[PDB]
Amino acid sequence: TPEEKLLRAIFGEKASDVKDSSLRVPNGVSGTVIDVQVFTRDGVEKDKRA
Amino acid sequence: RFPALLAELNDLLRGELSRLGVDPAHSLEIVVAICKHLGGGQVYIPRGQALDSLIRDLRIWNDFNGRNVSELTTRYGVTFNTVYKAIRRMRRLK
Amino acid sequence: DTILAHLDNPAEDTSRFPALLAELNDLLRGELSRLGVDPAHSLEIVVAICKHLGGGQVYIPRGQALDSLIRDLRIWNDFNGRNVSELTTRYGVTFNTVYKAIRRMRRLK
Amino acid sequence: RFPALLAELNDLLRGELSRLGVDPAHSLEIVVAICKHLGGGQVYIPRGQALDSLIRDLRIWNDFNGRNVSELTTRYGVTFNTVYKAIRRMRRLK
Amino acid sequence: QDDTILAHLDNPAEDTSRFPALLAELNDLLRGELSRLGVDPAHSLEIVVAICKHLGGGQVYIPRGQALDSLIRDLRIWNDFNGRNVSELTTRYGVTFNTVYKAIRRMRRLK
Amino acid sequence: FGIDMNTDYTLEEVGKQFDVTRERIRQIEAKALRKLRHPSRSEVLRSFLDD
Amino acid sequence: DPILLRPVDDLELTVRSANCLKAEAIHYIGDLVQRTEVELLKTPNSLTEIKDVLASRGLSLGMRLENWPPA
Numbered sequence: 001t002p003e004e005k006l007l008r009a010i011f012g013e014k015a016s017d018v019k020d021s022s023l024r025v026p027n028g029v030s031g032t033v034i035d036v037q038v039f040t041r042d043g044v045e046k047d048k049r050a
Numbered sequence: 051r052f053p054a055l056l057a058e059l060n061d062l063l064r065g066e067l068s069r070l071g072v073d074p075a076h077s078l079e080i081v082v083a084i085c086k087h088l089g090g091g092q093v094y095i096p097r098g099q100a101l102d103s104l105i106r107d108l109r110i111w112n113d114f115n116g117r118n119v120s121e122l123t124t125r126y127g128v129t130f131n132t133v134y135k136a137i138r139r140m141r142r143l144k
Numbered sequence: 145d146t147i148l149a150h151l152d153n154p155a156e157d158t159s160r161f162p163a164l165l166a167e168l169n170d171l172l173r174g175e176l177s178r179l180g181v182d183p184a185h186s187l188e189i190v191v192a193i194c195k196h197l198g199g200g201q202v203y204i205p206r207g208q209a210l211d212s213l214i215r216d217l218r219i220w221n222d223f224n225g226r227n228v229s230e231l232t233t234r235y236g237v238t239f240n241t242v243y244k245a246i247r248r249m250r251r252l253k
Numbered sequence: 254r255f256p257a258l259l260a261e262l263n264d265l266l267r268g269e270l271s272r273l274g275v276d277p278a279h280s281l282e283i284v285v286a287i288c289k290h291l292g293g294g295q296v297y298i299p300r301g302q303a304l305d306s307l308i309r310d311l312r313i314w315n316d317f318n319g320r321n322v323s324e325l326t327t328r329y330g331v332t333f334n335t336v337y338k339a340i341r342r343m344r345r346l347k
Numbered sequence: 348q349d350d351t352i353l354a355h356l357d358n359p360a361e362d363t364s365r366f367p368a369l370l371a372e373l374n375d376l377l378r379g380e381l382s383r384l385g386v387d388p389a390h391s392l393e394i395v396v397a398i399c400k401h402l403g404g405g406q407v408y409i410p411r412g413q414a415l416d417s418l419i420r421d422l423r424i425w426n427d428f429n430g431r432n433v434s435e436l437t438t439r440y441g442v443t444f445n446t447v448y449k450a451i452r453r454m455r456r457l458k
Numbered sequence: 459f460g461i462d463m464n465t466d467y468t469l470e471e472v473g474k475q476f477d478v479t480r481e482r483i484r485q486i487e488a489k490a491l492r493k494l495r496h497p498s499r500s501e502v503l504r505s506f507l508d509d
Numbered sequence: 510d511p512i513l514l515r516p517v518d519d520l521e522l523t524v525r526s527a528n529c530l531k532a533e534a535i536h537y538i539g540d541l542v543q544r545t546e547v548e549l550l551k552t553p554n555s556l557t558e559i560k561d562v563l564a565s566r567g568l569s570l571g572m573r574l575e576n577w578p579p580a
Contacts, residue, residue: 255407255408255414256418257458260422261402263422265398265401267426269398273381273386274385276384278426279384281423282380283376283377286380287373287376289411290369290372290373291373291409295408296406296407298406298407299403301363301367301370303363303367304360304363304367307356311349312349315349346355
């Protein structure tokens with residue numbers, strides 16, 4: 001809309017081709033992480049955590 | 051033009067920060083601030099006569115105690131009517 | 145200054161881009177509050193900006209030019225004539241960048 | 254207002270005469286002469302403000318030979334409009 | 348002194364008004380005084396510039412007769428005063444001790 | 459920006475209305491924007507930066 | 510009295526009167542009200558402009574005030 005791009009012009013920030021889809025802890029849950037199990041498809045390179 | 055101008059601005063700013071007692075290396079973000087709300091083109095920043103005249107008159111009436119009108123005219127190069135205006139202005143403030 | 149308190153509103157009376165740069169001193173005095181010194185000193189700097197930088201006009205860039213400028217200035221500020229390797233070690237840059245900063249310092253007048 | 258100002262004027266005249274080699278007492282004649290040829294009423298003594306701007310423009314276009322017009326704006330801090338008017342003025346005079 | 352073409356500047360000086368104009372007669376009188384005293388008359392303009400720059404700023408009035416002569420006598424008397432030559436001033440200027448005392452008072456009263 | 463209007467107008471579209479000046483209108487927009495960046499009116503606006 | 514501690518700025522006096530009192534450096538209304546008329550007439554150039562303005566404000570010169578100034 002005109003207002004949001006007006007703010008964009010005023011302050012100069014630009015949101016790039018990125019959208020937040022990160023996992024979040026469900027509300028009311030407080031605890032400790034025990035295991036992180038990551039599977040990756042064959043063909044694509046694996047991260048250093050993997 | 052712009053790189054040398056920015057370098058001069060930054061070094062003069064940091065020198066004044068050192069003069070004011072602040073760390074000179076804090077000048078950079080200031081010019082970055084100068085960027086964030088002023089970037090885009092070229093603007094003319096010549097004098098700003100308001101504050102200069104105000105500080106001039108402030109020093110004029112600071113020199114004034116009771117009777118130095120002749121010396122004020124000789125030094126600051128302004129007639130007695132300007133002195134009257136300055137004294138009235140300093141009477142306005144309480 | 146001192147009377148600057150009373151001058152608070154008259155500072156922008158019948159004003160111009162001073163008022164714009166009054167915004168500057170706001171930021172400045174904000175950083176001054178960040179710095180620890182009294183914010184009401186900011187006007188001094190700005191009036192100094194009027195006396196030693198005022199009188200002309202300047203164009204301002206927007207992008208990587210100022211990034212290169214700040215990197216090179218942080219490189220060259222610690223140069224003493226025999227500390228090129230010190231600059232390379234401290235700032236994590238190759239000899240090319242520090243030598244280019246030194247050439248930037250040399251070529252100016 | 255007249256006595257102290259006249260005394261200071263005579264002091265400066267005799268000092269200038271001594272600097273230039275003339276006898277300081279001759280300054281009395283000078284001031285007497287001017288006191289005969291400058292009277293008529295009341296008017297404040299200033300400078301050649303028109304002549305001040307004239308010599309200012311003279312210096313500006315003597316220093317000016319091209320791009321140093323920017324240096325002119327860096328010399329004291331003035332406008333390019335008055336500089337251009339002064340250039341046209343020096344073109345007008347022969 | 349970058350006057351240079353000041354002779355050409357005389358036409359703008361001829362085309363100026365207000366406080367200037369009369370100053371040209373002052374320059375002429377100063378150059379005549381310099382010629383009488385042996386100095387080069389062309390220096391006189393320089394002198395006037397000095398007396399224009401240092402003495403400008405305030406309001407002035409000049410008397411014509413007796414006050415001028417009294418001030419002349421007083422200034423001539425006290426310009427040779429060193430602090431302990433009152434009798435010397437009386438003998439040199441042919442004036443009484445009262446006149447020299449008045450000269451001292453006039454010299455010390457001015458600010 | 460075409461706010462409160464069915465459409466926006468470019469530099470040339472607004473030039474024919476008031477004045478055909480090119481850099482002057484751009485610096486008018488820049489001056490208005492920098493005036494809107496003053497921390498006397500923008501305190502509320504800055505909160506909208508996170509969205 | 511809430512007027513004695515107020516400075517001489519609250520008089521709205523004439524320029525000649527606003528200039529004459531600066532020679533004696535009067536900073537308080539009480540300072541001038543302590544001074545009587547028999548000694549404020551020696552300064553040049555006022556004698557017809559003080560009584561009316563002081564009476565309009567309910568004050569008169571010559572009154573005796575102790576512990577002045579109270580600082």
